[PDB]
Amino acid sequence: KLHKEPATLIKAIDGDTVKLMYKGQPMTFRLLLVDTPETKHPKKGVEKYGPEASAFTKKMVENAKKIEVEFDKGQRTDKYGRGLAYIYADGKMVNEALVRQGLAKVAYVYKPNNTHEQHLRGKSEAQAKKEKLNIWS
Ligand SMILES: Cc1cn([C@H]2C[C@H](OP(=O)(O)O)[C@@H](COP(=O)(O)O)O2)c(=O)[nH]c1=O
Numbered sequence: 001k002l003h004k005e006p007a008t009l010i011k012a013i014d015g016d017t018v019k020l021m022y023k024g025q026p027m028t029f030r031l032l033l034v035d036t037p038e039t040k041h042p043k044k045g046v047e048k049y050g051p052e053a054s055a056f057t058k059k060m061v062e063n064a065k066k067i068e069v070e071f072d073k074g075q076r077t078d079k080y081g082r083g084l085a086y087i088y089a090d091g092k093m094v095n096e097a098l099v100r101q102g103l104a105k106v107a108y109v110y111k112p113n114n115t116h117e118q119h120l121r122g123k124s125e126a127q128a129k130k131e132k133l134n135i136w137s
């Protein structure tokens, strides 16, 4: 029952937050189930691998032919008005790619928006951990 819908990139902001045109409306999207390191907020500062995660997401969405968003089963926006979705760049989930590279942690799992939680934890993050990649080094 989850389905992918088209969207158009407006601009990548950091590793886990991107602005997209979705159904004619400009919106900020925040990637479900992950957290890339901080690059903007003063209380946190530039966290290690924050710049790298931002560069990674920007490259991925900017070089994509097709961007798709897939909402989960619960809330579609968070308290800041950001769309909560799994985002796909030519069919590759950016959320998963970041976790697989050790550039993001599985975080903020709020049910019922947890459909891909087991794959992201058990496969992608577990593998990044085993390889000691980037945040896991
Ligand atoms: C990913 C995600 C984040 N959030 C909220 C939790 C955090 O709130 P707080 O600002 O109160 O800590 C914040 C983390 O996002 P950032 O990583 O963009 O800061 O966004 C949700 O409410 N739902 C989600 O699914």
Ligand SMILES: [Ca+2]
Pocket: 016, 035, 036, 037, 038
């Ligand atoms: Ca973040």
